[PDB]
Symmetry: D3
Subunit: 290 residues, 6 copies
Amino acid sequence: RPIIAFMSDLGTTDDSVAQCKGLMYSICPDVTVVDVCHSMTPWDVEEGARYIVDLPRFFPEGTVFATTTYPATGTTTRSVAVRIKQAAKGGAGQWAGSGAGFERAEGSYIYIAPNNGLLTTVLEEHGYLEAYEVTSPKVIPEQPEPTFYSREMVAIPSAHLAAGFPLSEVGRPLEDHEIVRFNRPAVEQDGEALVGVVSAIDHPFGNVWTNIHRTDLEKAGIGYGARLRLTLDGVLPFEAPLTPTFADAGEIGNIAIYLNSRGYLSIARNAASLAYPYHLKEGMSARVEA
Amino acid sequence: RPIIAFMSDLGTTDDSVAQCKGLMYSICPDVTVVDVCHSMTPWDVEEGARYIVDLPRFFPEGTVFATTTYPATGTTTRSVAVRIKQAAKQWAGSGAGFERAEGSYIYIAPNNGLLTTVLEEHGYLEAYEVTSPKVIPEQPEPTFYSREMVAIPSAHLAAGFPLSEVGRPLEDHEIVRFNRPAVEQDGEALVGVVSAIDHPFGNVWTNIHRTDLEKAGIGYGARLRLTLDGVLPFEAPLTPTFADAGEIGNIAIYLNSRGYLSIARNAASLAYPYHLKEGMSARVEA
Amino acid sequence: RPIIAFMSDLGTTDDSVAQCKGLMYSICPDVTVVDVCHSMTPWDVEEGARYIVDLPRFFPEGTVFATTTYPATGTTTRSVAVRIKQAAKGGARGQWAGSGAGFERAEGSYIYIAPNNGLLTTVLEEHGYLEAYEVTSPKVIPEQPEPTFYSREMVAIPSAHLAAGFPLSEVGRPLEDHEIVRFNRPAVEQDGEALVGVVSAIDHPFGNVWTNIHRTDLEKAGIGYGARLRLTLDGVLPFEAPLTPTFADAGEIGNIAIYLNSRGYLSIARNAASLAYPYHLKEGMSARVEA
Amino acid sequence: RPIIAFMSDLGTTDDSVAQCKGLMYSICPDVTVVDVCHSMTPWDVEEGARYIVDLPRFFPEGTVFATTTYPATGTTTRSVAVRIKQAAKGGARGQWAGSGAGFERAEGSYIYIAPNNGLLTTVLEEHGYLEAYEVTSPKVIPEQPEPTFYSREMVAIPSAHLAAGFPLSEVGRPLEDHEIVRFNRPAVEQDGEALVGVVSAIDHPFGNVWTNIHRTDLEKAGIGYGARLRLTLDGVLPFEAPLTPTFADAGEIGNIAIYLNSRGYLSIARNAASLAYPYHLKEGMSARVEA
Amino acid sequence: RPIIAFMSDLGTTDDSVAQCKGLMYSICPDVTVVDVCHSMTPWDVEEGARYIVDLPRFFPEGTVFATTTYPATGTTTRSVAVRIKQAAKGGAGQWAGSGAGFERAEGSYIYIAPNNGLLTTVLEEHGYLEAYEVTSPKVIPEQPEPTFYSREMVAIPSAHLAAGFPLSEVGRPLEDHEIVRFNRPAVEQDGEALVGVVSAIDHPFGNVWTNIHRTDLEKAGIGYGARLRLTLDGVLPFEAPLTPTFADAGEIGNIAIYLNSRGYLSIARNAASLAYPYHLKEGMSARVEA
Amino acid sequence: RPIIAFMSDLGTTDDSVAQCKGLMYSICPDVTVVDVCHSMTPWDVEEGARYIVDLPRFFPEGTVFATTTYPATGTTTRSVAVRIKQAAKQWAGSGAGFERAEGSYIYIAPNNGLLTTVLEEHGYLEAYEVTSPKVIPEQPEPTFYSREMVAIPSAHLAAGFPLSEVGRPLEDHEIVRFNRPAVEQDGEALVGVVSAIDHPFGNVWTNIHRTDLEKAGIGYGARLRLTLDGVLPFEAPLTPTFADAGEIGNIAIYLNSRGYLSIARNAASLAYPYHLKEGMSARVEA
Ligand SMILES: C[C@H]1O[C@@H](n2cnc3c(N)ncnc32)[C@H](O)[C@@H]1O
Ligand SMILES: C[C@H]1O[C@@H](n2cnc3c(N)ncnc32)[C@H](O)[C@@H]1O
Ligand SMILES: C[C@H]1O[C@@H](n2cnc3c(N)ncnc32)[C@H](O)[C@@H]1O
Ligand SMILES: C[C@H]1O[C@@H](n2cnc3c(N)ncnc32)[C@H](O)[C@@H]1O
Ligand SMILES: C[C@H]1O[C@@H](n2cnc3c(N)ncnc32)[C@H](O)[C@@H]1O
Ligand SMILES: C[C@H]1O[C@@H](n2cnc3c(N)ncnc32)[C@H](O)[C@@H]1O
Ligand SMILES: [Cl-]
Ligand SMILES: [Cl-]
């Protein structure tokens, strides 16, 4: 029972995703294609990365992740296919599922993506066992569509991998320095305050996500129940204790400062939108201190 | 051939829904997950209820409906899981339609009133709290009970985990319900609200029902005056469908697929040019 | 392993698509339902036609395409079901889709079921058809259809019977060619040495600009990759670039690229930036090309 | 104490109006310049005409109205200067303006100077005129006018000479009636017992709705204060109210009022709330009235 | 040299204001008409009031203020004309002008307005010497336009007053209880914090004005140089000392908490807009404390 | 017959401008106040400068220009008051125009660069700091120096208060100037910026001047290619006016009333449909 989990920038306004899916079911008759999302900001590899980094532990072993934003479509560039090392615990650290969670064995998931840095945080968080350039005409078209490499060089070969084509056969092995990566912005300790950035607005709720992690917090002594001052955009400070969840803020509309399901320091209002009335946005400065 | 039909307020702009689906396939390898929608206004229990209330008759017997908006996530609250009784009409499908046996569907949802109308329309045979670590995490992620307390246990139920083993039976009073706004009277006009804009067409749906109408003496021929937001008046005979208005753009006053007084333009949008909205008053007279 | 690929104007904000899907699994339990899209502008049959015309070569033979925008719901009109002839190559070069030399698809191997309102105009034009039938039989539609929901009653439902193996010729009577409603499509005019058409679509979510000037139209004027072109939009915007395979060929990020899209049509874009969104360019605007 | 009342399409965001004013005080030192408005949609002569047609009765006799939208700036066209005949009553009842029984104004006592582009169509129609002249004399316009600024060169400047006492008949040659450009205005049709016109304007900043159905048109059908009316807008909105003098007559705040505006025209509004803004009603929409 | 200072809700998009001005110059040949503003939110008498309350000290003695929003136009209602008592010092309290300012004698300005509460704060701040109902056909039309009382019952009689028509002759005297007034929202002392409201956004800068006055501040001990916490909309707190001016915030974009030229506690950014990016609005809660 | 022409960033949505005017009439009973505009983008010194630079030739001799955006309000800063020399062309008005004597106009402004282009184009005969309590308040309102340090002293100057008595003479270096962006070269294309959108018409004005053009070999007949924001290309002959384009909506490339390369549609807006903006690059080639 093979699964391909599919994350693109193709959107859902036309037949582009369906074209890829038609070919996936064509190549791997038994497959199940699960949509991750197709809504990412085009060409923003850092945003694409956040949508895929945390997926392994949720999926059955053997799952292939077809993940693509392909601004270098139709060039001489070729995709990278990697088998990861650890499925890894996550959240605000645990295995996912009922009971004590589902423990995932090492080397049980493959990502196939453009070699443009999309997989940077996947490789940082999970490690990898082996990496290959995707070049074989057994898995890609002999004459690929210049402007559709997300289909030609990701969707199509991912379905061959789902169908059982040996990963080592897709092309030559890539050395670590041949896999492109993006530079991750570092959390700064500024006196005793921690300085990062709004990493994401959490749609559709309007919760605010920072790149300040739970590990960064236990570094400066911060745990659940700590009074914090969190300044956004350099001028809007908020104040609240760190709490597990939204309803701990008290009344509806009140401010909650919490750890999100991905482990990162976040801010919201209790059953109300914070970001949307005050037009708060990704990329704004975020500062925290007790 | 187990099915989970999935309705949430998680949206489709990140991997939140995919995390839930991943766990569904892990738990029930042979499952088919059907998306209902994930677009609902966050925390609007009456809105989410509208999207799930008439689903059973359309699905194969044995379908599990996983339906969630969870603003009380991470608290001591636990989900409710119910088996409904009557799948409830006409029947849907080709010919005279497909009849559905009683007790053939399970809903699992936060215990916050989301299931209010499902229970009124269909009734139930059994209701339980979802507490067993067989079907939910021992360390549940505080901010993601739509995943922990709905998605995960729905998939155990799809795989044949016995309903009565999820936790203790709930008595009726323990099952939270929302109050639904009444259709009131002033003179011979009926006063209600706009209960929804029908995206993407811009049709207007009111809470004034077939039954409220015929009781006040209105059937499929009646010339009606329909005033919206207390300002915009519309006038037209009650008709079965849009094209009964004649010209493209003409006004149709009709009954939507739920028996509710509705208003639209024929093959054009009514709501969008006039910025008509849910929650606006709707007053009708013959 | 039967597939129904589903395209409608029902949107993704309520339970309308799910009702259709439920009834698909009810009638054909082993079916796989693949969403094409549900976002088309309601009642724009020309736009709907664009999202379904290119589908066959990507799908397994025996696939059923349920394609629907239904402004005449609740009327005496009934849907039309067609077996197409050629699965038809396509793309910028014109080839089969898939790895290696692509997946060659046999003739008469796909069914489309749709309102009889012109939605299938380009499907028939580009693929031809082998047989067409009016969808009237109570075996495949409800005896009491919901007046406002013919996308479900007259398309979703019968499509699932067809996917289950219900004989096509049994849905109702054969339709003569003149009984299949069509729309007229704009002809690219050969004006001097220029080619005059329109912006056919904005390519969401990138804001690329698609015209109705097809690759074969370009070969009427003898224009291939490397040709220095002037592509004028909206009468007043004379863009200038060589015709190149892809976006990155334009050099720096933001530079204008003139290219052939994945559907075989003359297009214009910027390299890893949006052309249509900043300047609010729209479908329907004029598009002129010349060398 | 000469007055120039000034209406243009120049806006209030730069120094364009001030340049015109400066030259007014330069040519006629004791002048008072009164802004009519500078907000009209550029080049919409019909809208401009609405802001100037009702002016004479409010102003001292001898006032000069400099009224300008000039899309043909820099061309061989020259402005036209007119002495009107009747100052003309008006308003919902039809009377003179001011305290007591109002200020009665004499015949032939106001001058309008404008581009010869139809801007003065309703002025002449409603007031008549006694003499008209092309504005050509270097005594009142520049010998080298700025190509893009004929609102200044061919209207502001000569208007200030006229206010200073420059003889009207000396600006240039007399113009025959057919030489004064006009636009055609929509005729309210007598359809059955209904009267069919349009929404002429949105009354900013209140969002009241003005139609082109005049009080005298209502008296063709015999409609006065107290008459229960149906006023249908945009073909689909049948408003119902008695015809009343004013807004508060409708009762509660927000209730629909149907009334005669201060310009003598059939209008519709809400009592101390906006009708046009919430529902995005627009000029050009249809307006039908009947009793 | 008579002056009429003219404040309406008529806007500047049509000839409505010019009609009034034509009649003003008709009635009072020597007059100068100064526009206060015509931009107010229609029918909002509290907003109209803020635009007129502070005008007397700036204008020559003898000035008439014609001030109007007239939602009761065309009814039996009649305007009120009042001679004020004190011109009054103002600002963050002084006379206006070069040197030590221009001292204005008592009873030297007249307001004419609808009797709908528009003049509430004028009468509270300045007092009055005499008040009259405007009813004489020597100053108003015998048949006034039903829908244009701002012209008929304000503009027109104001010009008669400018022209020298005796104020006592416009109609009968009104007793204090016959002059309509609006209820002013009270500043609350909530513990040691002061609770009011955003009274206005200061266009075009996007500065935020509160109804918390300098007097309210010296009541709780607050002067220039006091560290303050100011919460807006119940969730956005800001922190800054109270300073005289914007540039005291330091760098451009920094927050300044100050007293405005009208005497009220205010918040802004130094040469940047505060209200506009965060969509802050009139009517939002405002809380302050040291 | 004294005149004050008044330009500020105070807007027209409250009584800020009326307070200033009130004080002008108090100080100079016989004054005429002319509004220039009050709409300028707050604190944009180059923008406000554009609105005041060519005013003198249009006004009677003896006019005082009160011109202010004052982001440094309430600090130790004091305003500058200058008498300009050459009123500077053609001359404006009927006939051959009205010549203006030298030294006939005074500007008074914050000393923040607002007067940069006025001084470059016209020159000056004398410049002073505004410090005398004869002409400004002793207790100046900290947040309203546009009123205290511009409006009030301008009106004393209109009334005949001697210029040299406002405070001490300033040397040229004490008068703050802004740097103006240069028109540069790349190949035979000239590169500049859009210096303004011409509201309300939506015409586009560039900083590429008549002089920059003719030096590169371009006159009133030249077919030019004009690219805006680095993306949108336009092509058209250089013409005197809009109507030279022919059809309504056609493209005109012309010189605005300041000698600057400009682009527009004939009797339609160019900037608004395309969302063209000030600060966007403008590149021209013959
Ligand atoms: C197949 C890939 O083409 C890329 N793509 C789409 N449009 C552009 C563009 N204008 N420039 C560069 N890349 C683009 C998308 O990222 C898609 O994933
Ligand atoms: C897992 C559940 O978390 C809830 N959720 C998301 N954001 C908030 C918030 N600010 N307050 C309360 N609940 C929230 C959603 O309703 C989702 O269904
Ligand atoms: C079931 C079908 O109903 C059609 N539909 C929905 N709303 C309208 C309307 N206002 N007018 C005409 N057709 C409509 C949709 O096109 C859908 O496909
Ligand atoms: C003469 C006065 O008419 C008032 N006015 C304008 N429109 C309305 C309306 N729709 N309802 C009530 N009053 C209105 C304005 O406030 C103006 O000042
Ligand atoms: C009196 C002067 O005050 C200035 N002004 C108004 N708001 C601000 C602010 N937030 N920062 C700096 N200056 C400001 C204006 O520029 C006005 O001209
Ligand atoms: C001096 C006159 O210039 C006219 N004007 C300004 N811009 C344009 C344009 N793009 N097209 C035509 N006329 C224009 C205005 O209407 C003004 O009145
Ligand atoms: Cl799916
Ligand atoms: Cl004025």
